[PDB]
Design a protein around this ligand. Structure first.
Ligand SMILES: *[C]C1=C([C])[C]=C2C(=[C]1)N([C][C]([O])[C]([O])[C]([O])[C]OP([O])(=O)OP([O])(=O)O[C][C]1O[C](N3[C]=NC4=C3N=[C]N=C4[N])[C]([O])[C]1[O])C1=NC(=O)[N]C(=O)C1=N2C#C[C][N][C]1[C][C]C2=[C][C]=C([O])[C]=C12
Ligand SMILES: *[C]C1=C([C])[C]=C2C(=[C]1)N([C][C]([O])[C]([O])[C]([O])[C]OP([O])(=O)OP([O])(=O)O[C][C]1O[C](N3[C]=NC4=C3N=[C]N=C4[N])[C]([O])[C]1[O])C1=NC(=O)[N]C(=O)C1=N2C#C[C][N][C]1[C][C]C2=[C][C]=C([O])[C]=C12
Lengths: 499, 494
């Protein structure tokens, strides 16, 4: 019934917010729509897999908030396997390699690939993490899709194809679906291209022992009966002295403040009194989530390792159901498995098939890429299509179509009277990730603490000490990477010498 | 409590559906979120204006369903004033003209303008009205914005600017916000460029005497206590023998079938059991509505007529708050007024001002364009910002960003178990308009009649006889319009 703060949503963001407020001495209630906590994280447990993350899973260096929260809750990490060679599969052929980036030998194609990644980061440096709409060329960049940007930037099909794969994998959307400004912001706010794509020293370095679902579960344990499951919020009324929050199962909650810790568009599932301000009213209809099926195929042994493959495959081409895989074997070396993502339009297309049909397609692809008949002998399979989730809307996160970020971006975390906004989408560092969920939840909680006069303004945004367990190596470039010309740059140099 | 069909939404589409079902002998209930019917139509009445449409207003030739429904309800139309000259205001100067298209005098610019409009219609001919995703180049066209298309097509800035205005005015969205495939479909399904932009012989020919709100109001009169106001639907349960529909004020309704007659994205305001199928679940997060403020400035007399101007202004440029106006004077010649639309990003930008500040900006603009100090002396002002509406989401209609129509378009009117889908967004002719609302409402109603075994399959989609009161003249082109080369075409000949 009556409390200090109602938190809507029991994903990592809502749970982090509720924990901070509870630890500060406030009476909190978490209203969660599902019969479980965790949201876009979900750890399945059964005999065949022990445990498997079907949602968010990976953590890495510079993600210090999720690492600190998880450590406090008694969790540990382990390293994703990257000992052996990675594979880039292009035009029906596999090319083994080492390092974060697939190597290119052709001098022209090399210049083009080098320029693409460099330019992504160059453009990123002009975009403020906390206010992308303030970039000098914000409007110009926001009014084009990533498809248009790639068409302008990439002078080789090889670079364009890899860049396209990169976009699909990063944001589970097509290049023509997303704003260039928003995408460039997204990469920059994760620390740039190298940091976002890397396993070793990047976002995919580690997983939690026992699954990421334990983060939300263990906070629920701490909060006890304060977390209310199967309580979808339907109505928020701010016309009176205290805020009134109503659920689908007819219960009413009274609070001084509310934290909305749900994906921005899912705010549409709530009826507001008074109506939302114009800008937010329209913003929440303009911000979809991406499309992905996460698929895990289990084998008797991690047979790829014997061929000096780590299990990482970057797979180009329309025919391939999965464009990217990682070894998902347990740290102990058992429950051998390959994790793959079916991305964007392919998630839409292949959802039509049965689970068994998708398993067959994946195994046949992996057999081709790994050059191994053993890939045709799976022992188990698990998958989750996030497009079907009423209380997620998709995965991994919210994307912005052309024109939206400059027009509506300012609104994302602007309080509406006594409602404050959390959720990973409102983060300024690793927005879209579990790390961003923690940042946003704790920041929203502190906004309320400030509103109550409990903390000063300069304490709303708090820095995070670097993890001792997961140290971050700096991102470096070589002299040649910095100064080699683009393709048009080389042609301009040719045009001058000839004159 | 218990009925045959629950209709969610009491706009024109929901009302048309409910009327058809009621007239067929079925027990219907309409659940409407607001304290009024009409939705994206709203007629305000007061002493100063008599009546004014603040939402949808215009009807015209080929819109035979809305015309027939309105006639049956006892309504009449009158013609929007287009007797005198139209004005095109470009680079700070007014150029009076006659006919639907503003003239172009520079020869290269003429070729470019001619080619733009022609190409829009050429492309439209390859897009099926009932299945735009089946266009031969559907994917190619859906994967680019209208901005990209205009950049490719328009070899002059003059043509590009006018084309941009056209897009903003048609769909209350920026060229970079919308799919080219969807926009080309939208124009084609209204009958093409000439039909959509024209007052005389086009979509803006007429208004209803007394306001368009009377359509929904008079159907509410016919249905009596069957329309429930201030009943926002929050929950639909299809797990049992009968469908259960719950409202925010705690009431429960039981029906054999449901019609959803709300904008597609507003389906998000309803919690579903079982959950929606994947494709619809995601579709309804990908389909926003446009942004517009409709503004009506009142004057003592229709003074523009004395200068041989009809009141139509096409106003280019970023500085102008309003890009397009029409004379909104009553058929009797009193309550003189100019109607203008503040479109897309300008609706967002200028919403920050006060009502009085917007009035001043409009009056100063109209004084400039009409070249008349009389424009600085308004007697009254009314406006409505549709962006602020929880139960509309915007106006005039839903737009599709790049990539959405091909991936999710098939889902729009696909039934979900016992839920059928109406709303103007699901129409195949004048989708986006009051006409489309009637088409979709009646079609959804007939889908249910077929499901009940009351009518055969071939009766779900029904043709409409042409209005005797509002006859349609055919759209024609000249030999030169058809065969004159584009700018690149002329360069190839050189
Ligand atoms: C799904 C997914 C997947 C599949 C994957 C992934 C992911 C996902 N991610 C993301 C995460 O998960 C996120 O971010 C988080 O989780 C979020 O959180 P938040 O904010 O909290 O949210 P959520 O969860 O959603 O929650 C919410 C809640 O609420 C609720 N509700 C609703 N509604 C309502 C409610 N309640 C009451 N009422 C109402 N009305 C719900 O239910 C919930 O619960 C991730 N992340 C991380 O970190 N990591 C990872 O891993 C992940 N994942 C992914 C990844 C990928 N990666 C890849 C590989 C390679 C690469 C490269 C580059 C890039 O960029 C990427 C990549
Ligand atoms: C807003 C607007 C404006 C400002 C203007 C205009 C318009 C609009 N339009 C459109 C119309 O209005 C529409 O289409 C209709 O109305 C629609 O109908 P429907 O489908 O039925 O829908 P609605 O209304 O929305 O209804 C719905 C209902 O539902 C309800 N709900 C929600 N949610 C819910 C509910 N309930 C229960 N529960 C829940 N949950 C609500 O409340 C409602 O009631 C139009 N149209 C026509 O036809 N006409 C006109 O005029 C119009 N307008 C406009 C126009 C413009 N024009 C321009 C000038 C020049 C030009 C050229 C070209 C083009 O294209 C255009 C133009």
């Amino acid at each position: 019934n009556k409390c200090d703060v109602v938190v809507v949503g029991g994903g990592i963001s809502g749970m982090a917010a509720a924990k901070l407020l509870h630890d500060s001495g406030l009476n909190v209630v978490v209203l969660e729509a599902r019969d479980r906590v965790g949201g876009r994280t979900y750890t399945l447990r059964n005999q065949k897999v022990k445990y498997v993350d079907l949602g968010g899973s990976y953590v890495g260096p510079t993600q210090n908030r999720i690492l600190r929260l998880a450590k406090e809750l008694g969790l540990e990490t382990y390293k994703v396997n990257e000992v052996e060679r990675l594979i880039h599969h292009v035009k029906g052929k596999s090319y083994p390699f080492r390092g974060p980036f697939p190597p290119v030998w052709n001098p022209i194609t090399y210049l083009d690939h080098n320029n693409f990644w460099r330019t992504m980061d160059d453009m990123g440096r002009e975009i403020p993490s906390d206010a992308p709409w303030k970039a000098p060329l914000a409007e110009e960049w926001d009014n084009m899709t990533m498809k248009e940007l790639l068409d302008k930037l990439c002078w080789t099909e090889s670079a364009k194809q890899l860049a396209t794969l990169f976009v699909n994998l990063c944001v589970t959307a097509e290049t023509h679906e997303v704003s260039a400004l928003w995408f460039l912001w997204y990469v920059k706010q994760c620390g740039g291209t190298t940091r976002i794509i890397s396993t070793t020293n990047g976002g995919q370095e580690r997983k939690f022992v026992g699954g990421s679902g334990q983060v939300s579960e263990r906070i629920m344990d701490l909060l006890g009966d304060r977390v209310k499951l199967e309580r979808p919020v339907i109505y928020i009324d701010q016309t009176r002295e205290n805020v009134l929050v109503e659920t689908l199962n007819h219960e009413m909650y009274e609070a001084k403040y509310v934290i909305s810790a749900i994906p921005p568009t899912l705010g549409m599932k709530i009826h507001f009194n008074p109506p939302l301000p114009m800008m937010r009213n329209q913003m929440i209809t303009r911000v979809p989530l991406g499309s992905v099926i996460k698929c895990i195929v289990y084998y008797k042994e991690p047979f790829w390792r014997k061929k000096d493959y780590c299990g990482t495959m970057i797979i180009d081409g329309e025919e391939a159901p999965v464009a990217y895989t990682l070894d998902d074997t347990k740290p102990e070396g058992n429950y051998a498995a390959i994790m793959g993502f079916i991305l964007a339009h392919k998630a839409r297309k292949l959802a039509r098939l049965t689970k068994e049909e998708r398993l067959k397609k994946l195994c046949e692809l992996y057999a081709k890429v790994l050059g191994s008949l053993e890939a045709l002998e799976p022992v188990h399979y698990e998958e989750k299509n996030w497009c079907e989730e009423q209380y997620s809307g998709g995965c991994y996160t919210t994307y912005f179509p052309p024109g939206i970020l400059t027009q509506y971006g300012r609104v994302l975390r602007q309080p509406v009277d006594r409602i404050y906004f959390a959720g990973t989408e409102t983060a300024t560092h690793w927005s879209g990730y579990m790390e961003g969920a923690v940042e946003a939840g704790e920041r929203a909680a502190r906004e309320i603490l400030h509103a109550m006069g409990k903390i000063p303004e300069d304490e709303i945004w708090q820095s995070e000490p670097e993890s001792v367990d997961v140290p971050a190596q700096p991102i470096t470039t070589t002299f040649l990477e910095r100064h080699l010309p683009s393709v048009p740059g080389l042609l301009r140099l040719i045009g001058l010498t000839t004159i």
